[PDB]
CSV table of C-alpha atoms and ligand atoms in Angstrom, one decimal:
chain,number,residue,atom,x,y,z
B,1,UNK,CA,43.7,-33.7,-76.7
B,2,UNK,CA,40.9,-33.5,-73.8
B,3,UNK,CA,42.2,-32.8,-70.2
B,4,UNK,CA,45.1,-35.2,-69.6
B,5,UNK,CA,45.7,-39.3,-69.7
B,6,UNK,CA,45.0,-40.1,-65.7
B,7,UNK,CA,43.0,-38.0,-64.7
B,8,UNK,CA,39.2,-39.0,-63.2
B,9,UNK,CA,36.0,-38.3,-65.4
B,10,UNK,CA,33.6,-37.8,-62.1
B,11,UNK,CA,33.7,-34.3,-60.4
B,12,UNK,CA,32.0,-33.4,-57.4
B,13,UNK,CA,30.8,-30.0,-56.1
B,14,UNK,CA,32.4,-30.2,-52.6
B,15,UNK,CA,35.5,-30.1,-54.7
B,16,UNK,CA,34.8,-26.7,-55.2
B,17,UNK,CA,38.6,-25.0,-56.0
B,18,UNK,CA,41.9,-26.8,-56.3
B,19,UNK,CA,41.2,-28.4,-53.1
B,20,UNK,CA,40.2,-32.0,-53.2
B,21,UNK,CA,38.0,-32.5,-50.0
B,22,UNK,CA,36.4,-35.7,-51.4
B,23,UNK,CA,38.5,-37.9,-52.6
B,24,UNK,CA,36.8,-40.7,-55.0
B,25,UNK,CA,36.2,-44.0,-54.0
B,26,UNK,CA,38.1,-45.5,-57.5
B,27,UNK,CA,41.5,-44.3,-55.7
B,28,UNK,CA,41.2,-46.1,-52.7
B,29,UNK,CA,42.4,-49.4,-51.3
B,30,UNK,CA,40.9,-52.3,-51.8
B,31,UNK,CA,41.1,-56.1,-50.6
B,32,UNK,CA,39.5,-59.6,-49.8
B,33,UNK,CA,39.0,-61.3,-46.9
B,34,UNK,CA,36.7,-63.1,-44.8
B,35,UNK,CA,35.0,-64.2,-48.1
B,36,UNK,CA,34.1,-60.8,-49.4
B,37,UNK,CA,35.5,-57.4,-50.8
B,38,UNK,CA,36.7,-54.4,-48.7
B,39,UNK,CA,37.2,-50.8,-49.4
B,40,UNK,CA,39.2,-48.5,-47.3
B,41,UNK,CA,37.8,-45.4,-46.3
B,42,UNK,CA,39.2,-41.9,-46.4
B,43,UNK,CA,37.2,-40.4,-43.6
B,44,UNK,CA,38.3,-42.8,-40.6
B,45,UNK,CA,41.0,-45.5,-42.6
B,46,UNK,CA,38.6,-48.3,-41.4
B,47,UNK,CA,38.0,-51.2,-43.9
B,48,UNK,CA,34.2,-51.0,-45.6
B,49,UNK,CA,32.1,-54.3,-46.9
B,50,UNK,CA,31.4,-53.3,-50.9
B,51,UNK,CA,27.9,-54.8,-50.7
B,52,UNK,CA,25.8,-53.0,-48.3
B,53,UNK,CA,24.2,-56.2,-47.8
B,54,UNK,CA,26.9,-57.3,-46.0
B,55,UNK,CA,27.7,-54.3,-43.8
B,56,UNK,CA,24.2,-55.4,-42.6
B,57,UNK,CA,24.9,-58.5,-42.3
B,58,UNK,CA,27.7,-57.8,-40.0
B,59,UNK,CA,25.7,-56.0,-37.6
B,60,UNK,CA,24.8,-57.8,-34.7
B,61,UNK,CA,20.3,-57.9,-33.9
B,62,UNK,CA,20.0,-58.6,-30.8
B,63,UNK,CA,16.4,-57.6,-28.7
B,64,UNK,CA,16.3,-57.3,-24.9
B,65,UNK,CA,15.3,-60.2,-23.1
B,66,UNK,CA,12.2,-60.3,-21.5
B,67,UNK,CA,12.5,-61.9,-18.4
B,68,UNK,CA,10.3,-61.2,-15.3
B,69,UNK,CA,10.2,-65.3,-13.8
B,70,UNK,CA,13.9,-65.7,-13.0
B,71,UNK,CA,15.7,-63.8,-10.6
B,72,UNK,CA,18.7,-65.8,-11.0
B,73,UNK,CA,19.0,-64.4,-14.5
B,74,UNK,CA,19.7,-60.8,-12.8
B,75,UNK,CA,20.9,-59.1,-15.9
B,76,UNK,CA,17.4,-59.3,-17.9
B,77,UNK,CA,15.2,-60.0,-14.8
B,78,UNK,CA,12.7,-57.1,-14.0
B,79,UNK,CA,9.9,-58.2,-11.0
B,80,UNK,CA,6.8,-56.6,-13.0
B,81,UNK,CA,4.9,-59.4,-12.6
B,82,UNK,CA,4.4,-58.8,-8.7
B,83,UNK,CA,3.0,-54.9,-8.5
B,84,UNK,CA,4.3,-54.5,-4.7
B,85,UNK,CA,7.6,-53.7,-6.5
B,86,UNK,CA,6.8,-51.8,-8.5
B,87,UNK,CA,6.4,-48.2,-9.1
B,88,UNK,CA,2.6,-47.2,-8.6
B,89,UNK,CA,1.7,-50.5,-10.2
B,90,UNK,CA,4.2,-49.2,-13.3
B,91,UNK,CA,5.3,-52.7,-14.9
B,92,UNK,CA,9.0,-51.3,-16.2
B,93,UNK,CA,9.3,-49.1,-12.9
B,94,UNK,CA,10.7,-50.3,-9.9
B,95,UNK,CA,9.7,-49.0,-6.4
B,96,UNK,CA,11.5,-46.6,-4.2
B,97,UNK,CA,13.8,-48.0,-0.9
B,98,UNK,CA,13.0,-51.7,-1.3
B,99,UNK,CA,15.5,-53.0,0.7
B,100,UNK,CA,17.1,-56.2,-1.3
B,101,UNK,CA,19.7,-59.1,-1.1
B,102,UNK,CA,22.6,-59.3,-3.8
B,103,UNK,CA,24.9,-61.7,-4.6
B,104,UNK,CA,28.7,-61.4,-5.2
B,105,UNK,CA,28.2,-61.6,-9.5
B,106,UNK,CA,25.6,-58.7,-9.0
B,107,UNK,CA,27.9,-56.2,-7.3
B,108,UNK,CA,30.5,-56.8,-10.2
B,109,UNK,CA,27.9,-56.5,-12.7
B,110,UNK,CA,26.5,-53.0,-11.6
B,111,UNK,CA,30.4,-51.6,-11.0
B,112,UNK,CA,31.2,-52.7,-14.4
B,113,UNK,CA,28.3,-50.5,-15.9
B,114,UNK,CA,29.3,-47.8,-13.0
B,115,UNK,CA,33.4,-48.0,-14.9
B,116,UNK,CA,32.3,-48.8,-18.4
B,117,UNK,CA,30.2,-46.6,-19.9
B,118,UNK,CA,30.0,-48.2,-23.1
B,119,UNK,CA,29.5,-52.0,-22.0
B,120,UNK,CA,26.5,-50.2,-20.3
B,121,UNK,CA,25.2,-48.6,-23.5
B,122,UNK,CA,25.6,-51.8,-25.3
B,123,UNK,CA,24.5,-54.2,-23.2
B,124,UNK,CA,21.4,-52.7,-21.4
B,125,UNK,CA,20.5,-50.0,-23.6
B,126,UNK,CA,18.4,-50.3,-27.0
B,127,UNK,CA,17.0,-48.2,-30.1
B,128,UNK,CA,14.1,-49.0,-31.9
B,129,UNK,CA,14.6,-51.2,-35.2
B,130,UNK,CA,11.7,-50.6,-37.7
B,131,UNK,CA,10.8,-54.5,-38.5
B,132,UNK,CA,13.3,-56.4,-36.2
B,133,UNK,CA,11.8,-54.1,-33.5
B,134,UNK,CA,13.7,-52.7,-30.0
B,135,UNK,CA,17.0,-54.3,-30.0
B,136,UNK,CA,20.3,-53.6,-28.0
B,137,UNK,CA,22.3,-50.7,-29.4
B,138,UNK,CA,25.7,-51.1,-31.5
B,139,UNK,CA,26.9,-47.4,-31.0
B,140,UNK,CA,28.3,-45.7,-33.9
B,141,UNK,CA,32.0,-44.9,-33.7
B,142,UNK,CA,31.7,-41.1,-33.1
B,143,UNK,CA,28.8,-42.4,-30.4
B,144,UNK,CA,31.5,-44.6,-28.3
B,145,UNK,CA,34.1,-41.6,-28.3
B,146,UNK,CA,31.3,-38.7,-27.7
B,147,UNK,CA,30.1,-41.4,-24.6
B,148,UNK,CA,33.6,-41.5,-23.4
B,149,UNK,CA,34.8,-37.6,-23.5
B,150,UNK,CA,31.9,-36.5,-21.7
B,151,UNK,CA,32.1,-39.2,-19.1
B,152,UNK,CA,36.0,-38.4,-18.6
B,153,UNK,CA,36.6,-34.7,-19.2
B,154,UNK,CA,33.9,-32.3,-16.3
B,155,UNK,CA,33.5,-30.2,-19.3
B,156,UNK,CA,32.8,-30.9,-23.1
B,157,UNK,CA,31.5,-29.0,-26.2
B,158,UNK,CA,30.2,-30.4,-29.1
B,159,UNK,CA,30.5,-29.2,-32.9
B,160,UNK,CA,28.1,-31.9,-34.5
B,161,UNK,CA,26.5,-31.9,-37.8
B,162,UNK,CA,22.8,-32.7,-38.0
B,163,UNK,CA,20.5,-36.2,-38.1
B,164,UNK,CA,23.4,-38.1,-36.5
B,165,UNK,CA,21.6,-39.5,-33.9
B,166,UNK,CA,23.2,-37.7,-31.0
B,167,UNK,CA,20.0,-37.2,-28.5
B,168,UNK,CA,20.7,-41.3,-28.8
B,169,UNK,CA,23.9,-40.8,-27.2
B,170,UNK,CA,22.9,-37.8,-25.0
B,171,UNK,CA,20.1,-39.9,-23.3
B,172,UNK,CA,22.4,-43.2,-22.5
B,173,UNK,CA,25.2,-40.7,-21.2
B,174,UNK,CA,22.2,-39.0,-18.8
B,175,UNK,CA,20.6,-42.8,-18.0
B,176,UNK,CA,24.3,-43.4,-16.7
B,177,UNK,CA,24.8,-40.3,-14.9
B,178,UNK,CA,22.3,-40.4,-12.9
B,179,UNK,CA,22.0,-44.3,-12.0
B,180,UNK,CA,25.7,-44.6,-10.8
B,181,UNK,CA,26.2,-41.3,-8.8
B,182,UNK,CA,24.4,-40.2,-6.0
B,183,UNK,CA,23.1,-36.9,-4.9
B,184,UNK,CA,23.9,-35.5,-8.3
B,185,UNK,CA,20.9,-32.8,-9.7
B,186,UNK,CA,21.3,-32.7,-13.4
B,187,UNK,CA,19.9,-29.4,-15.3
B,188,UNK,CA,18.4,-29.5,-19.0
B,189,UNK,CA,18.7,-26.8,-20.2
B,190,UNK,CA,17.4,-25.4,-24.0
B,191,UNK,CA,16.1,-22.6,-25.8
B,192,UNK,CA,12.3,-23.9,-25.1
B,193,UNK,CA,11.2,-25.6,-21.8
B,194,UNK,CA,9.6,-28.5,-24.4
B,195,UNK,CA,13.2,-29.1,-26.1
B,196,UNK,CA,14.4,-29.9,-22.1
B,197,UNK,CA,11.6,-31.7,-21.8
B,198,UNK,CA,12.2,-34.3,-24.9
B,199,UNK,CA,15.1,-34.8,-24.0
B,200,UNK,CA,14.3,-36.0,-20.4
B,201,UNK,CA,12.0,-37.8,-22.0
B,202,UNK,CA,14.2,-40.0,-23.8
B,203,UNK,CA,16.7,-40.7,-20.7
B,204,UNK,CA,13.6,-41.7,-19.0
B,205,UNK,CA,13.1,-44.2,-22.1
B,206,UNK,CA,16.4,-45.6,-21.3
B,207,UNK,CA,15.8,-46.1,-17.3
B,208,UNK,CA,12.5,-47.8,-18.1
B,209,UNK,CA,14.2,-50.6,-19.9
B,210,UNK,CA,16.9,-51.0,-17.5
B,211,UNK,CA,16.9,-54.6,-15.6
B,212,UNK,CA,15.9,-54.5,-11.3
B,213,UNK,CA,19.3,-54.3,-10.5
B,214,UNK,CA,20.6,-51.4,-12.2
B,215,UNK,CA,17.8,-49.5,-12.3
B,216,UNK,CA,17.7,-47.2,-9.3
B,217,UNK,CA,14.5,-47.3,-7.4
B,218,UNK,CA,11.9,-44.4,-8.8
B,219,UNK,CA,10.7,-41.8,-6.5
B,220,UNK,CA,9.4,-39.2,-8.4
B,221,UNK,CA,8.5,-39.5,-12.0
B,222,UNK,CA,7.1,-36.2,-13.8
B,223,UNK,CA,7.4,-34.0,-17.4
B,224,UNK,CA,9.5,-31.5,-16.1
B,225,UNK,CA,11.5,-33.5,-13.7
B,226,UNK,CA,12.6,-37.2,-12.0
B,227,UNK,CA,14.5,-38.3,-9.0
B,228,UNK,CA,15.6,-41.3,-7.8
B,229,UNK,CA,16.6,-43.8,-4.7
B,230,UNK,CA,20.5,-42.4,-4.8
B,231,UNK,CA,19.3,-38.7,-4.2
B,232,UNK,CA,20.3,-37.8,-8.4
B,233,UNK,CA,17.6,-36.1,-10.2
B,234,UNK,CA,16.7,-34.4,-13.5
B,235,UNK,CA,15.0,-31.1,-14.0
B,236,UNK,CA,14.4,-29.7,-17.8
B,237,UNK,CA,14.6,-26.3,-18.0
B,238,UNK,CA,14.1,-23.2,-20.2
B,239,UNK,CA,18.1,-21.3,-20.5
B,240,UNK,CA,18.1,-18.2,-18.7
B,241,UNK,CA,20.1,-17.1,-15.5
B,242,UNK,CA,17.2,-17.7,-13.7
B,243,UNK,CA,17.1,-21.3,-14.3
B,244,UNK,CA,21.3,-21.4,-13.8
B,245,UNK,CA,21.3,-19.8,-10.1
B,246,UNK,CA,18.2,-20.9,-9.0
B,247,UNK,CA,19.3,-24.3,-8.6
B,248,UNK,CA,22.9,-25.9,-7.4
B,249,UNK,CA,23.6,-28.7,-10.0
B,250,UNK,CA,26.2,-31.2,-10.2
B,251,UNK,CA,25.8,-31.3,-13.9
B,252,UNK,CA,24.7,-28.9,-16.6
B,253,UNK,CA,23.5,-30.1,-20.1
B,254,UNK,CA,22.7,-27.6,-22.8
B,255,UNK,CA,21.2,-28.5,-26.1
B,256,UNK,CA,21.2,-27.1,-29.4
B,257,UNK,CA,23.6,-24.3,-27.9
B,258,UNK,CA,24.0,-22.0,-31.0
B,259,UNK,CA,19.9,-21.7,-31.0
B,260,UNK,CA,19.3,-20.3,-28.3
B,261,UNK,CA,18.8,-16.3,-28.6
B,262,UNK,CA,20.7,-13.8,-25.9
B,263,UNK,CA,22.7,-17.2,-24.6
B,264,UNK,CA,25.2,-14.7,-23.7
B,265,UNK,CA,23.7,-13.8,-20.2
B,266,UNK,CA,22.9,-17.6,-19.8
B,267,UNK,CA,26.6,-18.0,-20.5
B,268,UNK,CA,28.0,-15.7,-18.1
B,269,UNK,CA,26.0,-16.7,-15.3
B,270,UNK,CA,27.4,-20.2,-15.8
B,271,UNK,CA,30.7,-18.9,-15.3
B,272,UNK,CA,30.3,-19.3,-11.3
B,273,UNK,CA,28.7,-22.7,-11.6
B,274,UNK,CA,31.9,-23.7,-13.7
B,275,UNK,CA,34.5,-22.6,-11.1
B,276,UNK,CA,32.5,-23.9,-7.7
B,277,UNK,CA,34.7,-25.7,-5.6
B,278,UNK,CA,31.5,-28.5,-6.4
B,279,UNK,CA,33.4,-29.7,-9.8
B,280,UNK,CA,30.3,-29.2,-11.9
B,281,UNK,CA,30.2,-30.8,-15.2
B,282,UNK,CA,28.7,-29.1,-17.8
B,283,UNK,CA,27.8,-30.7,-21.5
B,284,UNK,CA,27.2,-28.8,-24.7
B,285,UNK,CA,26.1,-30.0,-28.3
B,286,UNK,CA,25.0,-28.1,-31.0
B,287,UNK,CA,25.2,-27.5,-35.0
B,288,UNK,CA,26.9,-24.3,-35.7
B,289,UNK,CA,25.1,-21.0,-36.6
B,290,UNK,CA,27.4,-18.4,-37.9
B,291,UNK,CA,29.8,-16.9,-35.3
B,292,UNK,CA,28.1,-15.7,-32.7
B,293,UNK,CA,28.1,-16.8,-29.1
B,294,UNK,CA,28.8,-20.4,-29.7
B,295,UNK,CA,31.8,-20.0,-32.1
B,296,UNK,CA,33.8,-18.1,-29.0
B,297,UNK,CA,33.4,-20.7,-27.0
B,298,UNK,CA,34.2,-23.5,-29.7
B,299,UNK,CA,37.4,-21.5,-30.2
B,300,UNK,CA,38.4,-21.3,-26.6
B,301,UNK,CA,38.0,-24.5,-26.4
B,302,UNK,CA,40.1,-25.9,-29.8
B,303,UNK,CA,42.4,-23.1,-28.9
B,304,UNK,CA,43.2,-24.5,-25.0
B,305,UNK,CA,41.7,-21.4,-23.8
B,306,UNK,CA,39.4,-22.8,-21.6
B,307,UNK,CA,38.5,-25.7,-20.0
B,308,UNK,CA,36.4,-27.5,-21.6
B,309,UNK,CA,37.1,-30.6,-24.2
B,310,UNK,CA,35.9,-30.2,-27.6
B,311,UNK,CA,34.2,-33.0,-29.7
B,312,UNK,CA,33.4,-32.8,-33.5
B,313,UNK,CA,32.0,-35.3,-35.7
B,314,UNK,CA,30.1,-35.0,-38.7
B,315,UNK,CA,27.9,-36.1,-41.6
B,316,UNK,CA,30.3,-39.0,-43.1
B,317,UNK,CA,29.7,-40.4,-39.1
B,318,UNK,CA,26.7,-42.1,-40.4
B,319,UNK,CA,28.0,-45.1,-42.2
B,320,UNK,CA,25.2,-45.8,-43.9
B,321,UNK,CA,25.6,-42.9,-45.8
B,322,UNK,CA,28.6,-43.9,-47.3
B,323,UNK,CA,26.5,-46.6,-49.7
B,324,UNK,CA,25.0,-45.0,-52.9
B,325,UNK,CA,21.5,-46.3,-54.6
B,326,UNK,CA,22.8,-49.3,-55.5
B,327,UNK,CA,23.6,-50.5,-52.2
B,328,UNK,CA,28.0,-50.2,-53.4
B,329,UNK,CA,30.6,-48.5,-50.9
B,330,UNK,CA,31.3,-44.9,-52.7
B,331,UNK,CA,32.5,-43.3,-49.6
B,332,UNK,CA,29.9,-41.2,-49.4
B,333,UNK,CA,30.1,-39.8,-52.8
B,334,UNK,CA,26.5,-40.1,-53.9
B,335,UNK,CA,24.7,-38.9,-50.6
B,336,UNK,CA,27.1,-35.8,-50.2
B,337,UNK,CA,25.9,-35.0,-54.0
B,338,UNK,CA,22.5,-35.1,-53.8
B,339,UNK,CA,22.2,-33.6,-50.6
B,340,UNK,CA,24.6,-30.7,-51.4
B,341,UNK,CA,22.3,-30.3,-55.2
B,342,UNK,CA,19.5,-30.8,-53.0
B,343,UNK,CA,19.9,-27.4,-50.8
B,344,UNK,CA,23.7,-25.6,-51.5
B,345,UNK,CA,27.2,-25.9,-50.1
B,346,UNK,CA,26.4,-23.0,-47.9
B,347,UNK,CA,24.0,-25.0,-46.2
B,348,UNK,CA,25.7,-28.4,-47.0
B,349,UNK,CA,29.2,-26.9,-45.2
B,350,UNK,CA,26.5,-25.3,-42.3
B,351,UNK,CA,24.0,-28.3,-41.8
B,352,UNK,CA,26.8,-31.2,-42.6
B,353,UNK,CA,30.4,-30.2,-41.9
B,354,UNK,CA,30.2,-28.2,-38.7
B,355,UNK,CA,31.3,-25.2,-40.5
B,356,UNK,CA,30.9,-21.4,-39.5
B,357,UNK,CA,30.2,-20.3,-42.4
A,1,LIG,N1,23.8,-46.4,-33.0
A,1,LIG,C1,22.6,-46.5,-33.6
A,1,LIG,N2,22.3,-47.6,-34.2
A,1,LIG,C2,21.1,-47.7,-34.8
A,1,LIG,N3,20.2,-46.7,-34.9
A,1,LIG,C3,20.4,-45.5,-34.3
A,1,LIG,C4,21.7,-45.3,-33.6
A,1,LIG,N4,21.6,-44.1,-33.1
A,1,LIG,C5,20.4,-43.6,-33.4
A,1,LIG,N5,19.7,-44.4,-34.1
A,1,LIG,C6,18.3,-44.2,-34.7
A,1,LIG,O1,18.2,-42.9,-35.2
A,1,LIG,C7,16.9,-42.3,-35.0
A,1,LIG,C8,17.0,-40.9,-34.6
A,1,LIG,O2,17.9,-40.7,-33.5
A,1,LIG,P1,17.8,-39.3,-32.6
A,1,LIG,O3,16.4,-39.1,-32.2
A,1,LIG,O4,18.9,-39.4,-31.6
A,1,LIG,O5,18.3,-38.2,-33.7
A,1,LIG,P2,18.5,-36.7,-33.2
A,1,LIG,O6,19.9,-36.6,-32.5
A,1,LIG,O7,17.3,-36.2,-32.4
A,1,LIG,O8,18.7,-35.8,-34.5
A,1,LIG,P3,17.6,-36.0,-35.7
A,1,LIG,O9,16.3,-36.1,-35.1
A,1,LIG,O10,17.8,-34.7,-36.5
A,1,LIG,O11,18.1,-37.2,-36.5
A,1,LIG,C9,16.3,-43.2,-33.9
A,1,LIG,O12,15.0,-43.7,-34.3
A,1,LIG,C10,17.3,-44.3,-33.6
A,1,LIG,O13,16.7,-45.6,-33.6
């Protein structure tokens, strides 16, 4: 007699000792509706198309109207058409105090993006599809609760795995910030001054698609830095104390925070921005690097020591993962195996599962 009656003849490395981490997709629940077959997921206990096909299907391609004739259609109407308007004769950019009429509908429209961040993301904000082309974006559950803890908690640290499509998220949350508050200077900050600078680059992106009336009138427009009509502005930044006190900002974002070498003395030097009677917020994302710096203030944080909010999400977030080769729902089984085969679980645990190491 081989290893016993019920038990599975597909192993997986994750599942490493004893502990079953992944479980396989043979086990879980199944069912049929809405004409097709479902499987139930172990990472989130949402219900999963079989066919790939059809998780694609589902998905909603929708572009961003172009509409710069009808005023009356607000909500996709952008007056590039007539230069005066616009930003140094920038088609996407409108100009700076341009004093305009409203109507009742508009005021509702640009206080539900100021409450909702998500309706905001989704309805005005896009990502680049490569044959259907620039299309409004459907965020990705751990997208829709990252957008929501930063916009409700003043301070939030996040333990994310890689290629998740997080400076997506970052972008829209900085696009928002900045449109519906005024007088807010937001800081960049990054181990390189270009690293800031992408990363303003891509909010930018997603202010230059925004419609007349939301977008807030541009008065300065540079690499390092923008500001706008309402007094908010963003300045990318290289991390160092010098960057911290030499500027009093309403919001500090810090990227790729377990990267950047002697953070410490960046770190402490925050400390005083953190407990200004201003309220600052202050953002930070990252993939784990061993325990230094970045694991003591993860900890603080899971352990209520602190007070900031922390986030984690990681590789099974990316649903499209959770299809193998053959375009079937395995949970992830397939990609986790090939990518782990592909480098090691140190590396897997590391890159992929927010892990310390
Ligand atoms: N919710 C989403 N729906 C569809 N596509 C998305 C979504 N979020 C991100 N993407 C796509 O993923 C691609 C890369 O995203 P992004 O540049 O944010 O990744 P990143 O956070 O910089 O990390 P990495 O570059 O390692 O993937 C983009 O081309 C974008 O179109």
């Amino acid at each position: 007699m081989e290893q016993p009656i019920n038990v599975l003849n597909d192993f997986h490395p994750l599942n490493e000792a004893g502990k079953i981490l992944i479980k396989h997709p043979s086990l879980a629940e199944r069912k049929d509706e809405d004409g097709i077959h479902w499987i139930k997921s172990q990472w989130d206990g949402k219900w999963y198309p079989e066919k790939f096909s059809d998780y694609l299907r589902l998905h909603k391609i929708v572009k961003i109207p172009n509409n710069s004739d009808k005023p009356e259609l607000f909500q996709t109407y952008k007056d590039k058409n007539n230069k005066r308007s616009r930003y140094m004769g920038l088609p996407n950019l409108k100009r700076a105090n341009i004093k305009t009429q409203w109507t009742r509908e508009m005021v509702e429209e640009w206080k539900k993006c100021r409450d909702d961040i998500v309706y905001f993301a989704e309805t005005y904000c896009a990502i680049t599809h490569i044959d259907y082309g620039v299309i409004k974006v459907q965020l990705r559950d751990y997208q829709r609760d990252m957008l929501k803890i930063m916009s409700s908690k003043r301070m939030t640290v996040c333990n994310l795995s890689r290629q998740l499509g997080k400076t997506t998220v970052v972008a829209i949350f900085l696009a928002h910030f900045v449109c519906f508050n005024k007088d807010k200077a937001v800081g960049i900050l990054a181990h390189k001054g270009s690293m800031s600078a992408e990363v303003l680059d891509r909010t930018k992106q997603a202010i230059e698609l925004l419609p007349d009336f939301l977008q807030p009138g541009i008065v300065e427009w540079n690499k390092g830095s923008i500001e706008l009509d309402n007094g908010s502005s963003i300045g990318a930044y290289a991390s160092s104390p010098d960057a911290v006190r030499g500027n009093s900002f309403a919001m500090i974002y810090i990227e790729d925070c377990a990267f950047i070498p002697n953070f410490h003395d960046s770190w402490l030097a925050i400390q005083p921005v953190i407990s200004s009677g201003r309220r600052s917020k202050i953002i930070i994302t990252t993939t784990p690097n061993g325990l230094n710096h970045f694991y003591d203030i993860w900890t603080a944080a899971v352990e209520g020591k602190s007070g900031f909010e922390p986030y984690t999400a990681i590789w099974n977030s990316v649903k499209e993962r959770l299809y193998n080769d053959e375009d079937i729902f395995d949970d992830g089984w397939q990609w986790s195996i090939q990518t782990i085969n592909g480098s090691s679980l140190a590396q897997f645990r590391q890159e992929h599962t927010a892990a310390f190491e």
